[PDB]
Design a binder for this molecule. Structure first.
Ligand SMILES: *[C@@H]1O[C@H](CO)[C@@H](O[C@@H]2O[C@H](CO)[C@@H](O[C@@H]3O[C@H](CO)[C@@H](O)[C@H](O)[C@@H]3O)[C@H](O)[C@H]2NC(C)=O)[C@H](O)[C@H]1NC(C)=O
Ligand SMILES: *[C@@H]1O[C@H](CO)[C@@H](O[C@@H]2O[C@H](CO)[C@@H](O[C@@H]3O[C@H](CO)[C@@H](O)[C@H](O)[C@@H]3O)[C@H](O)[C@H]2NC(C)=O)[C@H](O)[C@H]1NC(C)=O
Ligand SMILES: *[C@@H]1O[C@H](CO)[C@@H](O[C@H]2O[C@H](CO)[C@@H](O[C@H]3O[C@H](CO)[C@@H](O)[C@H](O)[C@@H]3O)[C@H](O)[C@H]2NC(C)=O)[C@H](O)[C@H]1NC(C)=O
Ligand SMILES: *[C@@H]1O[C@H](CO[C@@H]2O[C@@H](C)[C@@H](O)[C@@H](O)[C@@H]2O)[C@@H](O[C@H]2O[C@H](CO)[C@@H](O)[C@H](O)[C@H]2NC(C)=O)[C@H](O)[C@H]1NC(C)=O
Ligand SMILES: *[C@H]1O[C@H](CO[C@@H]2O[C@@H](C)[C@@H](O)[C@@H](O)[C@@H]2O)[C@@H](O[C@@H]2O[C@H](CO)[C@@H](O)[C@H](O)[C@H]2NC(C)=O)[C@H](O)[C@H]1NC(C)=O
Ligand SMILES: *[C@@H]1O[C@H](CO)[C@@H](O[C@@H]2O[C@H](CO)[C@@H](O)[C@H](O)[C@H]2NC(C)=O)[C@H](O)[C@H]1NC(C)=O
Ligand SMILES: *[C@@H]1O[C@H](CO)[C@@H](O[C@@H]2O[C@H](CO)[C@@H](O)[C@H](O)[C@H]2NC(C)=O)[C@H](O)[C@H]1NC(C)=O
Ligand SMILES: *[C@@H]1O[C@H](CO)[C@@H](O[C@@H]2O[C@H](CO)[C@@H](O)[C@H](O)[C@H]2NC(C)=O)[C@H](O)[C@H]1NC(C)=O
Ligand SMILES: *[C@H]1O[C@H](CO)[C@@H](O[C@@H]2O[C@H](CO)[C@@H](O)[C@H](O)[C@H]2NC(C)=O)[C@H](O)[C@H]1NC(C)=O
Ligand SMILES: *[C@H]1O[C@H](CO)[C@@H](O[C@H]2O[C@H](CO)[C@@H](O)[C@H](O)[C@H]2NC(C)=O)[C@H](O)[C@H]1NC(C)=O
Ligand SMILES: *[C@@H]1O[C@H](CO[C@@H]2O[C@@H](C)[C@@H](O)[C@@H](O)[C@@H]2O)[C@@H](O)[C@H](O)[C@H]1NC(C)=O
Ligand SMILES: *[C@@H]1O[C@H](CO)[C@@H](O)[C@H](O)[C@H]1NC(C)=O
Ligand SMILES: *[C@@H]1O[C@H](CO)[C@@H](O)[C@H](O)[C@H]1NC(C)=O
Ligand SMILES: *[C@@H]1O[C@H](CO)[C@@H](O)[C@H](O)[C@H]1NC(C)=O
Ligand SMILES: CC(C)[C@H](N)C(=O)N1CCCC1
Ligand SMILES: CC(C)[C@H](N)C(=O)N1CCCC1
Ligand SMILES: [Hg+2]
Ligand SMILES: [Hg+2]
Ligand SMILES: [Hg+2]
Ligand SMILES: [Hg+2]
Lengths: 726, 728
């Protein structure tokens, strides 16, 4: 009947999920970057107008890949010469189009090679980084004010993060934050003077005669971390003769005793700012609440006004301490923190009360706080049906915590069990985004009465199209391991027959606070394997897994590469003894942390798996960056946790690879998990006389996402898997 | 009943070839290292006598990897802490043991990390290189004298070569030459200031947190080459001046006009040195003969004493200008040069007479000159039977070139057709080393009448073992293409049956002046593929191959990656016509230059090969070094030969790789054929969506000779080959 979902389909992306990306520009309108031009929509009625034609820039002379309109509506930042860097960062050329005079600004324009550009929240002000220094433009065409002069390549970063702050702590490239009305510009400074450098070769195009060596400050476990400083500058009080005067906010003293990190910065009001700090030992963090002193020009952070957040079972926050959400007057706030019982719920704070009040509770967790109004607190949780792989929008009455309403649960329970949301400026409206188990569904609503205004994108096209191909199904369920229940999912081949026996591929990640079992709808490699190759692709969340409380998550604290790997074995072990699983054909593969787990499992000696593929895996924790590693592993010193660091490497298990077919893959330009990791694995197998399969991808990074590489790695992996299974 | 030669046998070295390594200390004796006891032998009778006994260096705490006794026999240099570098260079620690008093010298020892050491050719003087500077010791226990101060890491090398000079010009690491007497010390100095650095990562042991970046000054095609200067210093003045001045010998003007290389330096007499030079365009070479001026204290090189050697069809010499061999008085010498017919023969030169006289025959070539006495001149050649893959020792009478005698041809014509030789200090005795087609045979002879004195090693031990195993055979014949014969080699499976069709693997190298078809007896991977997997392993020496004249060798001049490649394919066709080859199971593999040729063939689109393996191949000539590459390709510039440098890359044929199974292997620490080359090959196949097998070897260089790595690569290649042939 019909045809199946083939590898080509997946690689050639013949079945496209339609999206609806909007950007609210007020509490009543949003922008919708269509394909050619850009449109503005009226949330209330749905009518729209073109904001600016596509052709407006035909003879611009460059290809534009991003339009950033100032909150004014008077200017447009044009982004071109897009040269990607790490996960978030990138360099590019910029130009500003003045909408009033309908002309491109030609004087004092933004320097080529600019690292970052950001508009003030309200005006048309501009802060941008160039050569590691901050610059402010009060007017799009006027000269630029040098806010900082200490910028030095690979040494000092002003306004931007260094490799590790970008990937591990902020999860963003920018290191500057404007105050709500644009008066103040807060920023951080990173000194990487003593941070060791990671060096690897980049070959570039065939034409390059000599390979060049890329070197970037990257602290590995236990290495020397970059130090940081925080400053606040007044952007309404700068001359042009006198250099800008930035006031530094330091401490806390409890933090200054040893190494630490600047975790988060949030503006409570026009003159209050809160900064969360965390010790290198991500066990104890402090939040500071500083106020601007009018006739003093300094920022004071009164003690007693600070709040301490610590963990006795693990680390603070899922990956970092949570974002605080301040009330209108900035005198109180809400943030997600861990329960006494270890579950994540919303706590209510009083800037001067050392204790907060949980407004939500129960054995499920609040994913995130999405919107706050004097009226309600909007948030997402996996409380519905008690299934942690489901996400729904909720709103709790700030006057009566008893009046909690689920906004997405009942809209379409069959097709929707996983949501994300986007509120307008004042939360008058909100777009709901459903991504499973059925096809993605985008809808628009008004918060006054949770009226369902209209359907934005229903993927009706894709639906009609997919009903013509034998698509696989997905089963979410759980098993019980001595008391606790752990969820798992299984992509089942079309016309699945519980009577027949199918080979099984264990798709794993299992990093601390991860979830590979959910209700999201995906079109990926697994889809093809099941649809075309009739292979069952299963994923399992065991110890270390997230959104199920700290008892589960923190289970692997200071002990990576133990329970999560073992639970993965136990699971596959139970899957085989299920009847429809051919135990002679069970494989495993993972990418990144999942490459690590996969490699550790294959070298466990369980004998459960016939073959496995590891892509860009971690081989020994001392090779990964400090921030992420120390969080779960502590320091690699004999006084702390060195022993486990040494007992949890992949190479130590080399000898057990003798009983399995292993495929090791890794990009040569991986700036995240250095090629070093896989090179030490391959060398260890060679030392032990174990044969295996290998494949490197020159100049590819952790995502091995280049168009050609992508199709090539998935093609190679397919052969490997069906060769092992057939 | 009777087992075969297995991969494990090969990998574990079950069946070992015995050797007999000598070290002539005089004209009558030689030292033989018996692993625990090094004894001195008397060529005349066969005496023994321990020279340095079993337990003489215990309580040393350090293992000695090699020794080296001083010419006057009074001392012995103990080498330990060996740490390899490139093909010849290496670092090590040293200690000098005094024999005149069985004591171990502890005063003014030689520095650790010493890059190189050599005794004077007479007596007990020492000259070593440390931190790129030259040092000299008159007495082993006395403080040395520094002779150079310009030593600088990766920039200025004194007494030692840089990377390219070590691998492509001298084929030696050392760059200093004591005069025969030991009075003068000549050395070269290299300046690599402007030479680009090749850079790659070195991961080291697992305990290393951050990878290391090895960077070696290495000139790729057309890049900036190092510059050179030649100096000579008088070591007998060291104890009278304080800072002995190093006299420099420059020019020739015909060389100074552009980039050039110092090729060879050999002492003619007590105060006469000959220096060979070559332009970067390796078609013009010049030899200078300089004499010490006991009045000026300088060294002059009379122009009437200068010799020009230029080639019109290719480069000069096989891999470099020929080496000169002077007569006692240094007034005449012998060099190997190609005659007008294009064959390499020995011709006689008079230092002050521009034209030389050829003393050897015609259609075959002299491989090298081995010894020179007042009576005769000994040389090795492939004249016998007219087979270039054969090798024999001959001696020609100096007073009458019509009197030529083959000292090895007939010793054992059935078992020995490839010899190498090692004469004594005065050529009074000489050891013959037979390499095939039979088992290695080492014998000792006296020059008076050339009679065998005795057999030093007959491998009868190994012979006894190999008879109890189904060994494979070797067919060494030839084929004629375009009325000119090219020799081939075939390692046939036991009980070969011309009726039954056999799978075939083409073992290739095919580089400029090479020989893959010979008479040498080998115990390698091929012995396994034939003995056990019943696979015919063949080799073919087509255009570009050497020892058969410049007509054949220079065929691929400025055309690298052409005929050499097409011939290799034709040979496969020719082999198929023979009738005992399975057309649908023909594979091809090669390492180094063979990897390159192998890839080019795989990307040819001539559906003759099913699969192929390339170990550490060259992908595009602009990636290889200048000295080797330019010698055959000229400059990679639009004026010169750029067009072909680009027309001969492996990546330009990525597309065709869809019709063959490819396995690309390469070591990441390869300082010769950089990983970059295979990195660009993988990247190109990926760009065109062609699948292939791959394997990298962490921290392995061009040899991939690490004990464990070596086993791993051959195990990995074996699976690929038998899978491709559908055995197992
Ligand atoms: C090795 O070769 C390099 C060149 O490849 C030699 O270095 C060059 O030496 C000259 C003279 O010693 C330098 O010129 C001087 O520059 C200084 C500073 O600009 C100036 O004050 C002097 O008047 C003079 O012009 C030249 O800069 C330098 N080039 C480089 C790239 O370093 C070097 O001397 C050679 N070493 C040996 C031992 O032969
Ligand atoms: C033994 O003699 C050699 C050569 O005569 C000495 O080396 C020479 O030393 C000088 C100074 O150390 C080197 O540099 C010169 O320095 C001046 C100072 O400013 C500078 O203006 C000149 O341009 C020049 O660079 C000189 O290049 C160097 N020559 C050589 C061939 O190495 C050596 O120092 C003497 N050893 C002892 C222990 O006296
Ligand atoms: C960025 O961070 C640097 C250190 O992390 C600041 O600097 C300091 O560090 C250097 C060394 O890293 C100190 O010492 C220098 O001189 C001594 C003298 O021998 C050397 O031993 C040492 O290796 C250094 O060369 C400096 O003394 C120290 N402070 C100062 C003021 O020099 C650096 O100031 C900082 N930059 C910014 C903009 O914050
Ligand atoms: C969308 O159209 C809006 C006008 O639409 C009419 O009036 C509405 C109140 C409603 O009854 C609808 O059904 C009618 O067709 C228009 O609204 C207003 O906002 C603009 C400024 O943005 C203002 O200039 C205009 O006068 C207003 N109109 C009214 C009658 O209130 C709105 O501009 C438009 N939005 C877009 C993006 O096209
Ligand atoms: C950023 O650079 C571009 C391109 O010019 C660069 O700088 C030149 C000095 C030269 O080194 C080029 O190779 C560089 O690419 C500037 O755009 C102008 O583009 C025109 C058309 O190609 C060219 O003729 C001009 O030389 C370029 N610049 C100037 C000053 O003439 C662009 O102005 C630079 N951006 C900023 C804000 O300085
Ligand atoms: C703004 O402060 C910076 C501080 O560095 C000044 O810039 C430097 O000034 C010194 C003079 O002491 C110069 O030698 C440097 O070349 C300048 N550049 C840099 C990047 O350091 C600058 O002069 C100050 N501006 C004013 C108006 O005071
Ligand atoms: C943005 O907020 C700032 C800070 O609250 C406002 O600036 C202050 O304005 C008051 C009077 O309204 C002055 O007395 C202070 O001196 C200002 N503070 C500073 C540090 O300059 C500003 O008015 C707000 N902007 C708008 C448009 O309301
Ligand atoms: C946070 O973790 C640290 C250790 O990483 C705990 O402090 C002590 O650290 C030393 C050295 O590693 C250990 O020997 C102790 O067992 C740790 N605890 C104590 C009580 O000394 C620290 O206790 C942790 N913080 C919290 C709040 O649990
Ligand atoms: C061998 O070395 C030299 C090579 O000529 C011999 O010659 C002497 O060289 C020095 C210069 O270093 C001159 O001053 C002498 O005049 C040369 N000697 C004669 C006899 O002319 C040297 O004599 C020999 N040395 C040894 C140890 O044999
Ligand atoms: C050696 O080869 C070079 C090639 O580099 C020849 O040099 C150039 O000049 C010649 C004139 O004498 C031309 O005829 C060559 O074509 C030219 N070669 C190139 C590539 O530019 C040189 O002639 C040769 N020398 C001898 C003795 O044959
Ligand atoms: C070897 O023996 C020499 C003497 O050998 C004897 O005399 C000679 C003339 C022959 O007749 C021989 O057969 C006799 O055995 C010694 O002079 C010499 O030093 C010895 N050399 C060694 C290395 O032991
Ligand atoms: C309980 O389950 C955990 C998680 O799988 C497992 O590690 C353990 O062996 C079981 N028993 C005990 C006593 O922990
Ligand atoms: C070489 O090193 C050893 C120990 O590392 C030391 O004992 C010896 O003295 C050193 N030699 C010199 C000349 O410094
Ligand atoms: C004829 O020429 C050569 C010999 O010079 C021979 O090897 C080749 O096969 C023939 N020509 C071609 C185009 O191959
Ligand atoms: C998952 C993400 C937060 C993380 N920084 C990461 O890149 N991982 C790569 C494998 C080990 C850590
Ligand atoms: C063969 C040798 C003289 C040479 N240096 C070499 O390493 N080759 C490697 C393949 C291309 C050149
Ligand atoms: Hg943090
Ligand atoms: Hg998470
Ligand atoms: Hg040379
Ligand atoms: Hg040769």
């Amino acid at each position: 009947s019909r045809k199946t979902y083939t590898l080509t389909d997946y690689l050639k992306n013949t079945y496209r999920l339609k999206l609806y990306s909007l950007r609210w520009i007020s509490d009543h309108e949003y922008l919708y970057k269509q394909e050619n031009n850009i449109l503005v929509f009226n949330a209330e009625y749905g009518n729209s107008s073109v904001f600016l034609e596509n052709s407006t820039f035909d003879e611009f002379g460059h290809s534009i890949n991003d339009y950033s309109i100032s909150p004014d509506g008077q200017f447009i930042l044009l982004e071109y010469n897009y040269v990607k860097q790490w996960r978030h960062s990138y360099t590019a050329s910029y130009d500003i189009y003045d909408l009033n005079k309908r002309q491109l600004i030609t004087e004092e324009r933004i320097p080529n090679n600019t690292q970052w550009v950001t508009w003030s929240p309200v005006g048309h002000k501009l802060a941008y980084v160039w050569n590691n220094d901050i610059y402010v433009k009060i007017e799009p065409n006027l000269p630029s004010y040098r806010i900082t002069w200490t910028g030095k390549e690979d040494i000092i970063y002003n306004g931007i993060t260094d490799w590790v702050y970008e990937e591990e702590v902020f999860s963003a490239y920018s290191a500057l934050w404007w105050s709500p009305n644009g008066t103040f510009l807060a920023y951080a400074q990173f000194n990487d003077t003593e941070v060791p450098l990671i060096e690897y070769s980049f070959y570039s195009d065939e034409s390059l005669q000599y390979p060049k060596t890329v070197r970037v400050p990257y602290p590995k476990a236990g290495a020397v971390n970059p130090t940081v400083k925080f400053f606040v500058v007044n952007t309404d009080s700068l001359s042009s003769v006198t250099n800008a005067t930035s006031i530094q906010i330091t401490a806390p003293a409890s933090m200054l005793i040893g190494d630490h990190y600047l975790c988060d910065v949030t503006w409570a009001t026009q003159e209050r700012i809160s900064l969360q700090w965390l010790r290198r030992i991500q066990n104890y963090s402090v939040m500071d609440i500083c106020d601007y002193d009018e006739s003093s020009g300094r920022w004071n952070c009164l003690v007693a006004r600070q709040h301490i957040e610590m963990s006795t079972t693990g680390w603070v926050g899922r990956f970092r301490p949570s974002e605080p959400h301040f009330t209108l007057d900035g005198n109180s706030f809400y943030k997600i923190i861990s329960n006494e019982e270890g579950y994540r719920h919303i706590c209510y704070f009083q800037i001067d009360k050392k204790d907060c009040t949980f407004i939500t509770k129960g054995t499920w967790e609040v994913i995130g706080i999405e919107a706050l109004t004097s009226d309600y607190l909007y948030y997402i949780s996996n409380e519905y049906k008690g299934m942690p792989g489901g996400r729904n929008l909720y709103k709790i009455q700030l006057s009566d915590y008893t009046k909690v309403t689920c906004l997405s649960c009942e809209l379409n329970p069959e097709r929707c069990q996983y949501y994300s949301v986007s509120f307008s400026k004042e939360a008058k409206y909100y777009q709901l985004r459903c991504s499973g188990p059925g096809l993605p569904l985008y809808t628009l609503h008004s918060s006054v009465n949770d009226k369902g205004l209209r359907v934005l994108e229903d993927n009706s096209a894709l639906d009609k199209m997919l009903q013509n191909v034998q698509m696989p199904s997905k089963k979410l369920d759980f098993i019980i391991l001595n008391e606790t229940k752990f969820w798992y999912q299984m992509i089942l081949p079309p016309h699945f027959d519980k009577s027949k026996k199918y080979p099984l591929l264990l798709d794993v990640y299992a990093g601390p606070c991860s979830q590979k079992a959910d209700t999201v709808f995906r079109l990926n490699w697994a889809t093809y394997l099941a649809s075309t190759e009739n292979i069952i692709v299963a994923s399992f969340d065991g110890r270390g897994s997230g959104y199920q409380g700290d008892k589960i998550m923190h289970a692997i604290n200071r002990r990576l590469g133990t329970f999560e790997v073992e639970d993965q074995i136990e699971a596959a072990r139970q899957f085989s003894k299920m009847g429809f699983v051919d135990n002679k054909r069970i494989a495993i593969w993972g990418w990144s942390y999942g490459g690590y787990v996969t490699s550790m499992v294959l070298g466990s000696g369980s004998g459960v798996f016939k073959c496995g593929i590891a892509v860009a895996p971690v081989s020994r924790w001392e090779y990964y960056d400090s921030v992420y590693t120390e969080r779960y592993m502590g320091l690699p010193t004999p006084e702390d946790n060195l022993d486990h660091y040494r007992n949890s490497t992949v190479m130590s298990r080399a000898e057990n690879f003798k009983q399995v077919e292993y495929l090791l893959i890794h990009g040569t330009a991986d700036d995240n998990v250095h090629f070093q990791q896989s090179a030490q694995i391959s060398k260890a197998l060679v030392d032990v006389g174990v044969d295996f399969q290998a494949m490197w991808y020159t100049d590819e990074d952790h995502g091995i996402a280049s168009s050609t590489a992508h199709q090539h790695i998935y093609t190679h992996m397919s052969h490997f898997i069906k060769q092992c299974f057939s």
